[PDB]
Design an enzyme around this catalytic site. Sequence first.
Site, PDB file in Angstrom:
ATOM      1  N   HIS A  43       0.804  -1.216   0.000  1.00 23.46           N
ATOM      2  CA  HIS A  43       0.000   0.000   0.000  1.00 23.46           C
ATOM      3  C   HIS A  43       0.842   1.274   0.000  1.00 23.46           C
ATOM      4  CE1 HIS A  43       0.402   0.247   4.519  1.00 23.46           C
ATOM      5  NE2 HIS A  43       0.320   1.538   4.242  1.00 23.46           N
ATOM      6  N   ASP A  91       0.115  -7.456   1.518  1.00 27.83           N
ATOM      7  CA  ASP A  91       0.572  -6.073   1.568  1.00 27.83           C
ATOM      8  C   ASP A  91       2.092  -6.003   1.675  1.00 27.83           C
ATOM      9  OD1 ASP A  91       0.609  -3.350   1.704  1.00 27.83           O
ATOM     10  OD2 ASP A  91      -0.002  -3.214   3.811  1.00 27.83           O
ATOM     11  N   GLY A 186       2.477   6.639   8.945  1.00 23.16           N
ATOM     12  CA  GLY A 186       3.871   7.016   8.746  1.00 23.16           C
ATOM     13  C   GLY A 186       4.854   5.905   9.084  1.00 23.16           C
ATOM     14  N   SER A 188       4.016   2.757   8.444  1.00 26.80           N
ATOM     15  CA  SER A 188       3.706   1.781   7.402  1.00 26.80           C
ATOM     16  C   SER A 188       4.913   1.412   6.547  1.00 26.80           C
ATOM     17  CB  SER A 188       2.593   2.316   6.491  1.00 26.80           C
ATOM     18  OG  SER A 188       1.409   2.583   7.227  1.00 26.80           O
ATOM     19  N   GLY A 189       5.022   0.130   6.211  1.00 24.41           N
ATOM     20  CA  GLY A 189       6.130  -0.336   5.400  1.00 24.41           C
ATOM     21  C   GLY A 189       7.357  -0.619   6.245  1.00 24.41           C
TER      22      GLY A 189
END
Lengths: 238, 27
Positions: A43, A91, A186, A188-189
């Site tokens: 995402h 994801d 923020g 995320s990943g």
Amino acid sequence: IVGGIEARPYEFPWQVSVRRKSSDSHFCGGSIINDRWVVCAAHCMQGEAPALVSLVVGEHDSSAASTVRQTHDVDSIFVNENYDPATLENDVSVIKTAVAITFDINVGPICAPDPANDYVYRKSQCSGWGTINSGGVCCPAVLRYVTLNITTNAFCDAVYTSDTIYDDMICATDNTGMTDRDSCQGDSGGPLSVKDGSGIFSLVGIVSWGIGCASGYPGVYSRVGFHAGWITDTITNN
Amino acid sequence: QPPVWYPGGQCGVSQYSDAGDMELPPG
Ligand SMILES: *[C@@H]1O[C@H](CO[C@@H]2O[C@@H](C)[C@@H](O)[C@@H](O)[C@@H]2O)[C@@H](O[C@@H]2O[C@H](CO)[C@@H](O[C@@H]3O[C@H](CO)[C@@H](O)[C@H](O[C@H]4O[C@H](CO)[C@@H](O)[C@H](O)[C@@H]4O)[C@@H]3O)[C@H](O)[C@H]2NC(C)=O)[C@H](O[C@@H]2O[C@@H](C)[C@@H](O)[C@@H](O)[C@@H]2O)[C@H]1NC(C)=O
Ligand SMILES: [Mg+2]
Ligand SMILES: [Mg+2]
Ligand SMILES: [Mg+2]
């Protein structure tokens, strides 16, 4: 990161700050797995153009001048072909740099997880420059991190009374009500890791999604062990 | 075992011996 603390300079050397090149704006975290590859969330990369993204490593205080900070252009981006923007399944993504990342005491890769381990109840770490409150202003200058407990998928799925937690997902939260610790917008990943008796860190999750942040629901991450084969094939064939 | 994504050396090393040791209460 909600309910966590400041990281010491380069405490998590594999941490990556994914940013919009033109504005040097941090929008997602990432994890270095070798000198040409970084693991991130689908995402975060879906629809992104390599030329418009910058990967910053060796970062700590984004508001300070630094001789350690390395800014890298992106060569290519690979989003899991089965990523479902609706269910958040699969994801995961990997990003390749244009040039090799320089490794030293401050910058290095994190280990891969053992696919044959669900890490149930293990103590874990999650770091990033995400907001410190759901709805907070992005983003704090200094890297933060928090320790969490990896839950069973059944528990996490039970808490999400209106959402499905799939096998390719892994959740983590606090043991005090799920209102104290969590990853947020923020982060995320970024990495959800665990460490062994020697202090060696392994990437077991990728900050993916959740309802609020430390708002009574566990944070949900993409289970790296589940996607390990995909990551291996992708970075080996590209 | 974990796959080796970084054959160039040792992965997951932090310069701090107590890296990421923030306490996590049992509740
Ligand atoms: C991750 O969560 C696991 C589950 O925790 C419970 O559920 C979550 C949702 C949350 O509500 C937690 O607060 C719940 O505990 C953790 O496993 C549990 O660990 C606790 C210990 O903290 C276990 O309990 C003990 O059970 C023993 C056997 O009955 C008791 O003897 C013991 O009692 C003594 O100590 C308590 C407080 O510690 C006193 O109040 C008592 O008076 C008495 O003196 C505890 O009650 C519980 O059995 C575990 N649950 C399960 C299903 O295993 C897990 O903790 C980790 O794993 C366990 C097995 C231990 O190795 C822990 O040391 C270890 O931290 C959490 N993981 C992490 C990293 O926090
Ligand atoms: Mg245990
Ligand atoms: Mg559910
Ligand atoms: Mg399984």
